[PDB]
Symmetry: C2
Subunit: 600 residues, 2 copies
């Protein structure tokens, strides 16, 4: 029926070991994290009600008018994205959601989706983020949610027609979500215009952001300087956004520089709400962050104390505690912060076989010369440890800056970051140098993504493409100019929807249509695994990754309809050229299932 | 305390913090109340970044008139130790504090210590403790006595639920009264 496929999967994993790739082999410790209790009544009200009643303009105005600094939580998304390989199940978040709801009521919003999240949700992991949002939103009718949404490309790596991105944004709003964060890899104005107009047509809060890079204080670095940023802000506000943000995925912020930036933007825009995002990878997050929010500011971004430091967001505990003898006090019960931190400390040990902690110890500098985003940095770090070692990660970083520079001084976000990383991989595992390789750039066969970017698909940089390199590499291929969001031939949703409903029966939803629209092959793998193994995600993290051990008892509740207990009895031997079998007892009866070994 | 210490004849006076309980406003007004009467007596500040905001109080104390401060290696920093030296040497570009120390030195020091730290992994706290916590202002445990205190309980096991240990420590102090705990 239904549990039979679960039995098949568990037998398969115990006979063959882990299925999903594991960077380094280690055993997660058998400790179950505990959650402190919260009152059974409704959680105290927050910003979501204000947005629902007052409306987006009044919402932003009130956020500006609040007599104190406000807090926004990004633990659910960026903390594990940076430290882990964002392999966190929704089961982990379900046991903490009521805690945050009943305790953290003054939080501005919460960030839950991100760049390297949706793709990994099906590529390595096997989970659907749409139902994740569907379950999360209904459990928190208190705090508005926020995603990381790019302008032209919806969530993937390539541009999409205007209509499909519009549908993406409108359904994301209609699901119950409130606010969208709009940006792009390089500050290409039409991308922000498309994002903001889609958000406005959806009818939700429009929030544009500006990527920050370099240091404004240094007069040497003024290619994109304070006047450039304020001009960008003028363009965005002329387009019309409820709230402006400055984002630092590399955590390059410094106290006095961003303080004077905040002053120079607040004096010009007293009524404009501000938002700031940064990562602790530098090691000066809290100091600069407080000294920078001391001026006119609205919302700040923090992370859990357990997943603080390293390369994640500032710890909420430090920000709350240091602001006591100050008119902008946080007003946060601090034992609640302690309980939240200890919960996440206990839960962080679950994914012990893969963790930035196992790879590198306590974060470090050199981000001032690498400016790699935290999640991408950790991913590259442990991949370099896996295929190579920690010593071979060292030359990757010095090649990373070369790869970035040769493509111009461009902003490195998820698309551009992966572009520079793949080109650096070419650089390193091709065993080639700088001068000789770049003296003759025509003959080199760069991978698909490099040709895509140099071809102007994903977008044309504000600085502009390197003419000699582009001419050498592209040779004779069609080149898309202008905005390829419209320039590229738009596709129809109904054609692919018919194709997939005929290929995989009637069980098709538009969110699945979009997910296949990005990458059909990974969706095919996902649908095959769902067909062979049925429903999932009602299992423990240990159950999913390690499963039952010999002769141990555990309980699994799959559906509301029935309740089932599980006990591990024994395993047979190999009989038919490597075909194992397992004997297990269910409540009231025994069941026996054949499982094919993979060493045949 | 300061007047009798000066009357003793101490060459350089220092403010000592094991639990890293330094806050910006508190430290700046305290260093004001020190430097007001002693223009020629140098000051020294030592703290532990266990709570996660050591660098903030560090800059506050430095701007308040501090002269010498304690720091640890960049890769050896965070969690419970001194604030990262890279952040301190970096955050003083135009601020009159004026370190003038190259970033590359900190980079090489941090990478060497990062490489060497893996050797002592059989008793490293990072195998046990993931990140420093703000469970200090109510526990005031010194940095060097906190690591192994947690670590024995977690590694030998059954001491993972360490709350009751922190539950009893406060009133253990209270029996002896609020005592200077080093």
């Amino acid at each position: 029926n239904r549990a039979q496929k679960l039995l098949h999967y568990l037998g398969h994993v115990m006979v063959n070991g882990p299925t999903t790739p594991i960077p380094v082999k280690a055993s997660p410790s058998p400790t179950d994290p505990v959650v402190p209790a919260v009152p059974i009544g409704p959680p105290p009200a927050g910003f979501r009600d204000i947005l629902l009643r007052e409306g987006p303009e009044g919402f932003a105005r009130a956020v500006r008018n609040h007599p104190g600094l406000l807090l926004m939580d990004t633990t659910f998304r960026d903390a594990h994205q940076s430290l882990l390989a964002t392999r966190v199940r929704t089961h982990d978040l379900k046991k903490i959601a009521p805690y945050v709801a009943h305790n953290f009521s003054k939080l501005f919003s919460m960030e839950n989706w991100g760049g390297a999240t949706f793709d990994v949700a099906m590529r390595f992991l096997y989970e659907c983020p749409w139902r994740r949002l569907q379950e999360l939103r209904e459990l928190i009718p208190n705090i508005p949610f926020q995603m990381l949404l790019r302008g032209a490309n919806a969530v993937g790596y390539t541009n999409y027609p205007d209509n499909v991105v519009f549908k993406f944004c409108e359904v994301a709003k209609e699901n119950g979500m409130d606010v969208f964060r709009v940006f792009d890899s390089l500050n290409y104005l039409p991308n922000m215009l498309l994002g903001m107009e889609a958000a406005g047509s959806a009818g939700g809060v429009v929030e544009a952001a500006i990527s920050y890079t370099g240091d404004v204080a240094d007069p040497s670095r003024t290619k994109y300087s304070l006047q450039y940023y304020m001009g960008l802000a003028e363009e965005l506000v002329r387009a019309g956004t409820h709230i402006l943000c400055i984002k630092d995925m590399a955590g390059l912020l410094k106290p006095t520089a961003c303080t004077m930036l905040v002053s120079s933007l607040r004096d010009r825009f007293p009524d404009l709400p501000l938002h700031i995002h940064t990562h602790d990878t530098s090691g000066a997050g809290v100091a600069a962050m407080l000294a920078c929010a001391q001026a006119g500011a609205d919302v700040v971004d923090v992370a859990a104390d357990s997943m603080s430091g390293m390369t994640s967001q500032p710890s909420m505990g430090a920000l709350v505690a240091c602001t006591r003898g100050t008119p902008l006090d946080t007003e946060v019960p601090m034992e609640r912060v302690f309980d939240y931190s200890e919960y996440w400390e206990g839960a962080r040990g679950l994914y012990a076989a893969f963790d930035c902690t196992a790879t590198m110890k306590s974060g470090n500098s050199d981000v001032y010369e690498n400016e790699i985003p935290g999640g991408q940095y950790t991913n590259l770090h442990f991949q370099a440890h896996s295929m190579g070692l920690g010593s071979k990660f060292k030359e990757v970083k010095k090649a990373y800056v070369e790869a970035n520079q040769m493509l111009g001084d461009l902003i490195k976000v998820t698309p551009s970051s992966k572009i520079v990383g793949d080109l650096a991989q070419f650089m390193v595992q091709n065993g080639l140098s700088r001068a000789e390789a770049e003296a003759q750039a025509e003959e080199l066969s760069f991978p698909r993504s490099v040709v895509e970017f140099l071809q102007g698909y994903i977008g044309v940089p504000h600085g502009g493409f390197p003419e000699p390199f582009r001419s050498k590499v592209l040779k004779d291929l069609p080149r898309v100019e202008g905005r390829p969001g419209a320039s590229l031939p738009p596709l129809d949703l109904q054609a692919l929807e018919k194709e997939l409903v005929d290929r995989h029966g009637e069980e098709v939803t538009p969110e699945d249509v979009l997910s296949a629209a990005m990458y059909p092959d990974v969706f095919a793998h996902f649908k095959d695994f769902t067909a062979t193994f049925g429903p999932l995600d009602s299992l423990n993290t240990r159950l999913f990754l390690q499963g039952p051990k010999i002769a141990e008892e555990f309980e699994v509740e799959l559906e509301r309809g029935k309740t089932l207990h599980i006990k591990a009895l024994a395993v047979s031997d190999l009989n038919r050229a490597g075909q194992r079998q397992v004997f297990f007892e269910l409540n009231g009866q025994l069941r026996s299932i054949l499982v094919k070994d993979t060493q045949a």
